[PDB]
Structure formats: structure tokens, C-alpha cells
């Protein structure tokens, strides 16, 4: 299921059952995004990630999400984005510099060895929502799908998480992510804020932020299970 399905089929057929219910308020908006993508292709433009990966962050169970990591837009280099914020496919070398920064801090914070590859799927399988606010991008055109309708989709997702009584930690990287604080404050959600891991900002405070260990300390305090951050 790709673009065709996103334009034409119910949420139940696109994402995990809990997510499908959570995203029901934006069912028409999702369909409209599928049409936007169809129009892009008809016009002789491409988009990233692959259609089958666009909604991938919502294919893991809504009820198990305990940490939210927000990204802005997918990687713009062809072949990098795979539908989970910051993740890349296992064969990708070198890693994008933002991911290399995230992994630098992972090693410093947790003491684990540097990951073998850039695939963050294990995090998604273990209750981390790796959510870009904008879920597609035109190749090599950073932030080119901003303002095209994804924002309402991804905001609906975040509000559904925040509305729950269940524990949530939100890792908020950069000023744009920090815009989410109001919706997060009225819930059972603690936000960890730092500069973004992009090389443009990382050295102003991303390094040293220890988000992984902090998120776990917060979770355990709230009686939730921590995340097993360990990557192979
Ligand atoms: Cl189609
Ligand atoms: Cl293109
Ligand atoms: Cl991405």
C-alpha cells in the first residue's frame, strides 16, 4: 500500500488499528495528501520517502508509545528517508550528519557502542514515535512540502498521544519542535528540550543533553516501562 491507497482507502487499511482511530479526525486530510502526491507524480515530480513508507511511524502500536521524537521534514537526499524521523536504511554510508550526531550523544549518554547502521526501526518497535511533522519532501528541495497539509495530520497524532493519561516523554529538538509545548503541558507529558542535532545547531547544546537516559528516568518515575534504547 502506497500513494494509491493513501488517496483511496480507509485509515484502517493504512496504519495500525489504534493509530487509525486516533487519526480519524484527519481521515479527509490524509486522503487529500494522497491526492497531493498523485498530482506531484502526474506533474513529473518525485517525492520522498517511498509511498509505502510515508505513514510508517503509524504502523507500530499507538497504545505502546511512551516517547515522542519530533523531526521537521524527511531527509531530502534520495535514498535516505524511510518514514521514521532521522532513520536511514541499513546500507546507507556515511550516515546523514544529523543521525551521526544523534548517535554521538547516544554513545555519550548511554555508554553503548556506536550503532552498526542507521536503522532506527528497533526504537519504533519499542514504543518510540519517530514522527516528522511533514511526512514527504521533493528530492533535494529541503522542506518543500511544508504547508501542504501534513501539519494537521501530525498535530492530530501528537494531540491524541498527549490526551492520554498514560506517561509520555517528548524529546523536542529545536525551536519548531518547542512550539508543541502548550498541547503537551495540559497532558501527562514531560518535554526534554535542546537544540536540534543537525550540524547547524548541535554544537550549541544538543551534545550533553542526555535525552535518552533522561527520558527513561522520567518514564520510570511515572511508573512506565523504560525504552530499551540499545541498537545492534
Ligand atoms: Cl493512484
Ligand atoms: Cl522531482
Ligand atoms: Cl527522515
- CATH number at 84 reads 3.40.470.10
Rounded to the nearest whole angstrom, what is the distance from the C-alpha of residue 27 to the centroid of ligand 3?
Answer: 23
Collapse the DSSP code of 53 into the 3-class scheme (helix H, G, I; strand E, B; otherwise coil) and give the result: helix
Q: Which cell goes with 136?
A: 514527504
User: Catalytic residue among 63, 73, 91, 228, which?
Assistant: 73
* For the CA of 131, the nearest ligand: 3
Q: Give the strands of the sheet with 168-173, arranged side by side.
A: 128-132, 67-71, 168-173, 189-194
Rounded to the nearest whole angstrom, what is the distance from the C-alpha of residue 123 to the centroid of ligand 2?
Answer: 31
Domain that holds residue 131: 1-232
Resolution in A: 1.4
Q: Which cell goes with 21?
A: 482511530
* For the CA of 9, the nearest ligand: 1
Q: Say which experimental method was used.
A: X-ray
Rounded to the nearest whole angstrom, what is the distance from the C-alpha of residue 216 to the centroid of ligand 2?
Answer: 41
**CA-CA distance, 166 to 10, in Å (whole number)?**
27
Residue 73 is a catalytic residue: yes
Q: Looking up cell 502526474, which residue turns up?
A: 42
C-alpha atoms less than 13 angstroms from C-alpha of 172 in its C-beta half-sphere: 20
Rounded to the nearest whole angstrom, what is the distance from the C-alpha of residue 55 to the centroid of ligand 1?
Answer: 16
> Domain count of the chain?
1
Rounded to the nearest whole angstrom, what is the distance from the C-alpha of residue 76 to the centroid of ligand 3?
Answer: 8
* For the CA of 43, the nearest ligand: 2
Is the distance from CB of 180 to CB of 170 less than 8 angstroms?
A: yes
Is the distance from CB of 206 to CB of 229 less than 8 angstroms?
A: no
Amino acid at each position: 500500500h502506497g500513494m494509491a491507497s493513501m488517496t483511496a482507502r480507509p485509515l484502517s487499511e493504512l496504519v495500525e488499528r489504534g493509530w487509525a482511530a486516533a487519526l480519524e479526525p484527519v481521515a479527509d486530510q490524509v486522503a487529500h495528501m494522497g491526492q497531493f502526491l498523485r498530482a506531484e507524480i502526474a506533474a513529473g515530480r518525485r517525492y520522498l520517502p517511498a509511498g509505502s513508507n510515508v505513514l510508517r511511524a503509524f504502523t507500530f502500536p499507538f497504545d505502546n508509545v511512551r516517547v515522542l521524537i519530533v523531526g521537521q521534514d524527511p531527509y531530502p537526499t534520495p535514498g535516505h528517508a524511510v518514514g521514521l524521523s532521522f532513520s536511514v536504511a541499513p546500507d546507507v554510508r556515511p550516515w546523514p550528519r544529523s543521525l551521526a550526531n544523534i548517535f554521538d550523544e547516544y554513545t555519550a549518554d548511554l555508554g553503548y557502542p556506536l550503532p552498526s547502521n542507521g536503522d532506527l526501526t528497533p526504537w519504533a518497535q519499542r514504543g518510540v514515535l519517530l514522527l516528522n511533522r511533514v511526512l514527504t519532501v521533493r528530492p533535494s528541495n529541503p522542506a518543500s512540502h511544508r504547508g501542504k497539509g501534513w501539519e494537521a495530520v501530525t498535530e492530530c497524532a501528537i494531540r491524541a498521544l498527549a490526551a492520554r493519561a498514560a506517561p509520555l516523554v517528548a524529546i523536542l529538538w529545536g525551536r519548531d519542535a518547542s512550539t508543541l509545548k502548550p498541547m503537551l503541558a495540559a497532558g501527562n507529558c514531560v518535554a526534554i528540550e535542546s537544540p536540534h542535532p543537525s550540524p547547524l545547531s548541535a554544537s550549541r547544546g544538543f551534545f550533553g543533553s542526555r535525552p535518552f537516559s533522561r527520558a527513561n528516568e522520567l518514564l520510570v518515575g511515572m511508573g512506565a516501562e523504560p525504552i530499551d534504547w540499545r541498537l545492534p
